PDB file of C-alpha atoms in Angstrom:
ATOM      1  CA  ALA A1112    -111.965-114.450  58.888  1.00  0.00           C
ATOM      2  CA  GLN A1113    -111.302-112.173  55.919  1.00  0.00           C
ATOM      3  CA  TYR A1114    -108.523-110.364  57.766  1.00  0.00           C
ATOM      4  CA  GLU A1115    -106.262-112.815  59.569  1.00  0.00           C
ATOM      5  CA  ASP A1116    -103.216-112.156  61.662  1.00  0.00           C
ATOM      6  CA  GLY A1117    -100.206-113.337  59.661  1.00  0.00           C
ATOM      7  CA  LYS A1118    -101.983-112.760  56.370  1.00  0.00           C
ATOM      8  CA  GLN A1119    -102.556-109.058  55.631  1.00  0.00           C
ATOM      9  CA  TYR A1120    -100.857-107.985  58.826  1.00  0.00           C
ATOM     10  CA  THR A1121     -98.879-109.376  61.772  1.00  0.00           C
ATOM     11  CA  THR A1122     -99.131-108.524  65.448  1.00  0.00           C
ATOM     12  CA  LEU A1123     -96.243-107.189  67.508  1.00  0.00           C
ATOM     13  CA  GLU A1124     -95.902-109.488  70.514  1.00  0.00           C
ATOM     14  CA  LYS A1125     -94.185-106.458  72.050  1.00  0.00           C
ATOM     15  CA  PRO A1126     -96.784-103.686  71.419  1.00  0.00           C
ATOM     16  CA  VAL A1127     -95.633-100.079  71.532  1.00  0.00           C
ATOM     17  CA  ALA A1128     -97.555 -97.689  73.820  1.00  0.00           C
ATOM     18  CA  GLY A1129     -98.081 -94.044  72.804  1.00  0.00           C
ATOM     19  CA  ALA A1130     -97.021 -94.740  69.188  1.00  0.00           C
ATOM     20  CA  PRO A1131     -98.437 -92.657  66.311  1.00  0.00           C
ATOM     21  CA  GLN A1132    -101.746 -93.913  64.954  1.00  0.00           C
ATOM     22  CA  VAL A1133    -100.455 -94.596  61.453  1.00  0.00           C
ATOM     23  CA  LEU A1134     -96.681 -94.858  61.250  1.00  0.00           C
ATOM     24  CA  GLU A1135     -94.716 -95.387  58.044  1.00  0.00           C
ATOM     25  CA  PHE A1136     -90.989 -96.093  57.628  1.00  0.00           C
ATOM     26  CA  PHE A1137     -88.992 -95.677  54.431  1.00  0.00           C
ATOM     27  CA  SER A1138     -85.509 -95.030  52.990  1.00  0.00           C
ATOM     28  CA  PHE A1139     -84.631 -93.136  49.826  1.00  0.00           C
ATOM     29  CA  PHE A1140     -82.400 -96.152  49.134  1.00  0.00           C
ATOM     30  CA  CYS A1141     -85.351 -98.547  49.398  1.00  0.00           C
ATOM     31  CA  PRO A1142     -86.543 -99.761  45.993  1.00  0.00           C
ATOM     32  CA  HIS A1143     -90.088-100.822  47.039  1.00  0.00           C
ATOM     33  CA  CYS A1144     -90.327 -97.440  48.780  1.00  0.00           C
ATOM     34  CA  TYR A1145     -89.677 -95.826  45.448  1.00  0.00           C
ATOM     35  CA  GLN A1146     -92.524 -97.874  44.073  1.00  0.00           C
ATOM     36  CA  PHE A1147     -94.680 -97.059  47.130  1.00  0.00           C
ATOM     37  CA  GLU A1148     -94.227 -93.344  46.568  1.00  0.00           C
ATOM     38  CA  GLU A1149     -94.025 -92.807  42.780  1.00  0.00           C
ATOM     39  CA  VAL A1150     -96.112 -95.590  41.315  1.00  0.00           C
ATOM     40  CA  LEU A1151     -98.512 -96.703  44.030  1.00  0.00           C
ATOM     41  CA  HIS A1152     -98.956 -93.541  46.108  1.00  0.00           C
ATOM     42  CA  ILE A1153     -99.632 -95.760  49.135  1.00  0.00           C
ATOM     43  CA  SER A1154     -99.561 -93.003  51.717  1.00  0.00           C
ATOM     44  CA  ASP A1155    -102.031 -90.887  49.908  1.00  0.00           C
ATOM     45  CA  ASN A1156    -104.463 -93.677  49.265  1.00  0.00           C
ATOM     46  CA  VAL A1157    -104.251 -94.803  52.878  1.00  0.00           C
ATOM     47  CA  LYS A1158    -105.008 -91.262  54.025  1.00  0.00           C
ATOM     48  CA  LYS A1159    -107.932 -91.087  51.581  1.00  0.00           C
ATOM     49  CA  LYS A1160    -109.596 -94.044  53.393  1.00  0.00           C
ATOM     50  CA  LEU A1161    -108.591 -93.345  56.962  1.00  0.00           C
ATOM     51  CA  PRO A1162    -111.193 -91.945  59.343  1.00  0.00           C
ATOM     52  CA  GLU A1163    -110.370 -88.429  60.215  1.00  0.00           C
ATOM     53  CA  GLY A1164    -108.843 -87.159  63.339  1.00  0.00           C
ATOM     54  CA  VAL A1165    -106.279 -89.772  62.308  1.00  0.00           C
ATOM     55  CA  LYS A1166    -102.714 -88.454  62.348  1.00  0.00           C
ATOM     56  CA  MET A1167    -100.486 -89.940  59.654  1.00  0.00           C
ATOM     57  CA  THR A1168     -96.706 -90.078  60.312  1.00  0.00           C
ATOM     58  CA  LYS A1169     -93.794 -91.004  57.978  1.00  0.00           C
ATOM     59  CA  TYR A1170     -90.156 -91.602  59.061  1.00  0.00           C
ATOM     60  CA  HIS A1171     -86.804 -92.200  57.350  1.00  0.00           C
ATOM     61  CA  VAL A1172     -84.375 -94.910  58.517  1.00  0.00           C
ATOM     62  CA  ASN A1173     -80.584 -95.155  58.870  1.00  0.00           C
ATOM     63  CA  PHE A1174     -79.836 -98.783  58.041  1.00  0.00           C
ATOM     64  CA  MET A1175     -79.584 -98.354  54.246  1.00  0.00           C
ATOM     65  CA  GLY A1176     -76.864 -96.453  52.392  1.00  0.00           C
ATOM     66  CA  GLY A1177     -74.365 -96.001  55.203  1.00  0.00           C
ATOM     67  CA  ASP A1178     -73.252 -92.421  55.706  1.00  0.00           C
ATOM     68  CA  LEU A1179     -75.599 -91.028  53.082  1.00  0.00           C
ATOM     69  CA  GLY A1180     -78.495 -92.875  54.666  1.00  0.00           C
ATOM     70  CA  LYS A1181     -77.907 -91.018  57.916  1.00  0.00           C
ATOM     71  CA  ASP A1182     -77.562 -87.754  55.991  1.00  0.00           C
ATOM     72  CA  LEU A1183     -80.946 -88.504  54.453  1.00  0.00           C
ATOM     73  CA  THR A1184     -82.579 -89.032  57.840  1.00  0.00           C
ATOM     74  CA  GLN A1185     -81.295 -85.625  58.944  1.00  0.00           C
ATOM     75  CA  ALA A1186     -82.582 -84.153  55.630  1.00  0.00           C
ATOM     76  CA  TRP A1187     -85.974 -85.721  56.124  1.00  0.00           C
ATOM     77  CA  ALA A1188     -85.962 -84.143  59.601  1.00  0.00           C
ATOM     78  CA  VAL A1189     -85.307 -80.785  57.892  1.00  0.00           C
ATOM     79  CA  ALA A1190     -88.104 -81.521  55.465  1.00  0.00           C
ATOM     80  CA  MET A1191     -90.509 -82.231  58.349  1.00  0.00           C
ATOM     81  CA  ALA A1192     -89.589 -79.148  60.355  1.00  0.00           C
ATOM     82  CA  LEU A1193     -89.997 -76.900  57.307  1.00  0.00           C
ATOM     83  CA  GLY A1194     -93.131 -78.667  56.089  1.00  0.00           C
ATOM     84  CA  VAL A1195     -91.585 -79.242  52.703  1.00  0.00           C
ATOM     85  CA  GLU A1196     -92.001 -83.025  52.463  1.00  0.00           C
ATOM     86  CA  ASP A1197     -94.090 -82.773  49.308  1.00  0.00           C
ATOM     87  CA  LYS A1198     -91.582 -80.743  47.379  1.00  0.00           C
ATOM     88  CA  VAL A1199     -88.606 -82.931  48.124  1.00  0.00           C
ATOM     89  CA  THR A1200     -89.729 -86.560  48.308  1.00  0.00           C
ATOM     90  CA  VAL A1201     -89.771 -87.144  44.567  1.00  0.00           C
ATOM     91  CA  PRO A1202     -86.476 -85.391  43.710  1.00  0.00           C
ATOM     92  CA  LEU A1203     -84.738 -87.208  46.584  1.00  0.00           C
ATOM     93  CA  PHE A1204     -85.984 -90.590  45.386  1.00  0.00           C
ATOM     94  CA  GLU A1205     -85.020 -89.846  41.775  1.00  0.00           C
ATOM     95  CA  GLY A1206     -81.663 -88.312  42.784  1.00  0.00           C
ATOM     96  CA  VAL A1207     -80.834 -91.460  44.780  1.00  0.00           C
ATOM     97  CA  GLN A1208     -82.315 -94.289  42.657  1.00  0.00           C
ATOM     98  CA  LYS A1209     -82.967 -92.956  39.121  1.00  0.00           C
ATOM     99  CA  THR A1210     -80.361 -90.363  38.169  1.00  0.00           C
ATOM    100  CA  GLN A1211     -77.674 -91.288  40.740  1.00  0.00           C
ATOM    101  CA  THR A1212     -76.821 -87.664  41.299  1.00  0.00           C
ATOM    102  CA  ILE A1213     -76.993 -87.722  45.086  1.00  0.00           C
ATOM    103  CA  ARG A1214     -73.675 -88.705  46.663  1.00  0.00           C
ATOM    104  CA  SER A1215     -73.057 -86.266  49.477  1.00  0.00           C
ATOM    105  CA  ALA A1216     -74.883 -84.059  51.932  1.00  0.00           C
ATOM    106  CA  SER A1217     -74.246 -81.203  49.468  1.00  0.00           C
ATOM    107  CA  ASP A1218     -76.163 -82.930  46.684  1.00  0.00           C
ATOM    108  CA  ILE A1219     -79.084 -83.513  49.096  1.00  0.00           C
ATOM    109  CA  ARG A1220     -78.958 -79.779  49.873  1.00  0.00           C
ATOM    110  CA  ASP A1221     -79.168 -79.009  46.126  1.00  0.00           C
ATOM    111  CA  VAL A1222     -82.515 -80.799  45.929  1.00  0.00           C
ATOM    112  CA  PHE A1223     -83.950 -78.471  48.552  1.00  0.00           C
ATOM    113  CA  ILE A1224     -82.422 -75.329  46.962  1.00  0.00           C
ATOM    114  CA  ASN A1225     -83.783 -76.321  43.601  1.00  0.00           C
ATOM    115  CA  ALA A1226     -87.163 -76.942  45.255  1.00  0.00           C
ATOM    116  CA  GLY A1227     -87.002 -73.347  46.445  1.00  0.00           C
ATOM    117  CA  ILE A1228     -86.024 -73.594  50.105  1.00  0.00           C
ATOM    118  CA  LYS A1229     -83.445 -70.925  50.850  1.00  0.00           C
ATOM    119  CA  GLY A1230     -79.840 -71.828  51.541  1.00  0.00           C
ATOM    120  CA  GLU A1231     -79.824 -69.947  54.790  1.00  0.00           C
ATOM    121  CA  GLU A1232     -83.098 -71.493  55.870  1.00  0.00           C
ATOM    122  CA  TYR A1233     -81.902 -74.977  54.981  1.00  0.00           C
ATOM    123  CA  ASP A1234     -78.525 -74.708  56.707  1.00  0.00           C
ATOM    124  CA  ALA A1235     -80.125 -73.177  59.808  1.00  0.00           C
ATOM    125  CA  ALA A1236     -82.663 -76.011  59.895  1.00  0.00           C
ATOM    126  CA  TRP A1237     -79.926 -78.601  59.209  1.00  0.00           C
ATOM    127  CA  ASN A1238     -77.921 -77.463  62.205  1.00  0.00           C
ATOM    128  CA  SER A1239     -80.792 -76.736  64.596  1.00  0.00           C
ATOM    129  CA  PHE A1240     -81.593 -78.657  67.790  1.00  0.00           C
ATOM    130  CA  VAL A1241     -85.231 -78.938  66.728  1.00  0.00           C
ATOM    131  CA  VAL A1242     -83.933 -81.059  63.868  1.00  0.00           C
ATOM    132  CA  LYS A1243     -81.692 -83.015  66.240  1.00  0.00           C
ATOM    133  CA  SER A1244     -84.665 -84.029  68.386  1.00  0.00           C
ATOM    134  CA  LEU A1245     -86.583 -84.816  65.207  1.00  0.00           C
ATOM    135  CA  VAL A1246     -83.785 -87.210  64.123  1.00  0.00           C
ATOM    136  CA  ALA A1247     -83.999 -88.694  67.615  1.00  0.00           C
ATOM    137  CA  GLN A1248     -87.701 -89.292  67.172  1.00  0.00           C
ATOM    138  CA  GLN A1249     -87.219 -91.085  63.858  1.00  0.00           C
ATOM    139  CA  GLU A1250     -84.613 -93.325  65.391  1.00  0.00           C
ATOM    140  CA  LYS A1251     -86.567 -93.985  68.588  1.00  0.00           C
ATOM    141  CA  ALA A1252     -89.677 -94.987  66.612  1.00  0.00           C
ATOM    142  CA  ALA A1253     -87.668 -97.473  64.550  1.00  0.00           C
ATOM    143  CA  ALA A1254     -85.914 -98.768  67.655  1.00  0.00           C
ATOM    144  CA  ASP A1255     -89.273 -99.143  69.396  1.00  0.00           C
ATOM    145  CA  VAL A1256     -90.536-101.591  66.755  1.00  0.00           C
ATOM    146  CA  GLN A1257     -87.726-104.066  65.848  1.00  0.00           C
ATOM    147  CA  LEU A1258     -87.312-102.377  62.466  1.00  0.00           C
ATOM    148  CA  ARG A1259     -85.135-104.389  60.071  1.00  0.00           C
ATOM    149  CA  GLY A1260     -86.990-103.696  56.839  1.00  0.00           C
ATOM    150  CA  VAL A1261     -88.692-101.001  54.786  1.00  0.00           C
ATOM    151  CA  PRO A1262     -91.271-100.082  53.574  1.00  0.00           C
ATOM    152  CA  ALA A1263     -93.128-100.649  56.802  1.00  0.00           C
ATOM    153  CA  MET A1264     -96.350 -99.389  58.266  1.00  0.00           C
ATOM    154  CA  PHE A1265     -97.546 -99.782  61.846  1.00  0.00           C
ATOM    155  CA  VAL A1266    -100.999 -99.076  63.213  1.00  0.00           C
ATOM    156  CA  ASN A1267    -101.353 -97.978  66.852  1.00  0.00           C
ATOM    157  CA  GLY A1268     -98.048 -99.625  67.750  1.00  0.00           C
ATOM    158  CA  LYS A1269     -99.900-102.922  67.597  1.00  0.00           C
ATOM    159  CA  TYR A1270    -100.166-104.048  63.966  1.00  0.00           C
ATOM    160  CA  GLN A1271     -97.740-104.279  61.073  1.00  0.00           C
ATOM    161  CA  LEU A1272     -98.898-104.247  57.447  1.00  0.00           C
ATOM    162  CA  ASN A1273     -97.932-107.377  55.614  1.00  0.00           C
ATOM    163  CA  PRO A1274     -97.929-106.621  51.875  1.00  0.00           C
ATOM    164  CA  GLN A1275     -96.389-109.969  50.876  1.00  0.00           C
ATOM    165  CA  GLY A1276     -99.754-111.497  51.788  1.00  0.00           C
ATOM    166  CA  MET A1277    -101.825-109.446  49.271  1.00  0.00           C
ATOM    167  CA  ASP A1278    -102.282-110.000  45.476  1.00  0.00           C
ATOM    168  CA  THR A1279     -99.830-108.106  43.206  1.00  0.00           C
ATOM    169  CA  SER A1280    -101.265-108.938  39.757  1.00  0.00           C
ATOM    170  CA  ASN A1281    -102.916-105.524  39.703  1.00  0.00           C
ATOM    171  CA  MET A1282    -101.298-102.459  41.273  1.00  0.00           C
ATOM    172  CA  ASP A1283    -104.611-100.656  41.882  1.00  0.00           C
ATOM    173  CA  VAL A1284    -106.080-103.701  43.603  1.00  0.00           C
ATOM    174  CA  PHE A1285    -102.933-103.987  45.712  1.00  0.00           C
ATOM    175  CA  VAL A1286    -103.258-100.377  46.927  1.00  0.00           C
ATOM    176  CA  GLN A1287    -107.011-100.674  47.706  1.00  0.00           C
ATOM    177  CA  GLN A1288    -106.372-103.837  49.674  1.00  0.00           C
ATOM    178  CA  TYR A1289    -103.469-102.277  51.474  1.00  0.00           C
ATOM    179  CA  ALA A1290    -105.444 -99.166  52.346  1.00  0.00           C
ATOM    180  CA  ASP A1291    -108.590-101.077  53.406  1.00  0.00           C
ATOM    181  CA  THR A1292    -106.359-103.178  55.631  1.00  0.00           C
ATOM    182  CA  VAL A1293    -105.030-100.066  57.291  1.00  0.00           C
ATOM    183  CA  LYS A1294    -108.602 -98.883  57.784  1.00  0.00           C
ATOM    184  CA  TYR A1295    -109.613-102.255  59.243  1.00  0.00           C
ATOM    185  CA  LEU A1296    -106.643-102.260  61.610  1.00  0.00           C
ATOM    186  CA  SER A1297    -107.373 -98.681  62.472  1.00  0.00           C
ATOM    187  CA  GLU A1298    -110.885 -99.544  63.693  1.00  0.00           C
ATOM    188  CA  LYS A1299    -109.801-102.651  65.590  1.00  0.00           C
TER     189      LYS A1299
END
């Protein structure tokens, strides 16, 4: 076939019921994730080709960057609750991997403040139980799927994108292939 298990994707032998339709995992410490967001815009090109009525979900993970990594998962929870993902993703990535100016929860906070979220609103979000549950969800979803690496995308709790098995000579061709694979898996 043109799409083969073990080539553009792999199948979870332990499928996950009730999982989000399109589920992405990343870390602000993850260098391919940086690429995936800033250079490739994977998520947006996937969305562009997905059917609609398709919910797209993106989660942060704890297993990179120790204490800061966990701080970042709580911050991403804050971002999700406030709906401010698109004003913080880039400065978080650049603060972690480019400029090296994020070293504490307080520096993460600065990114939000500078993006215009109010101190009060941020701290209230940070400490809220809605955010707690939202951290729980991120962790549960990673636990549910054997997650040991990022970036990672899962479709319907059944299929895992396998980017190693796609051509990388051309970034645009890589993205199209990636996104078309998601669409294919989606319709399976």
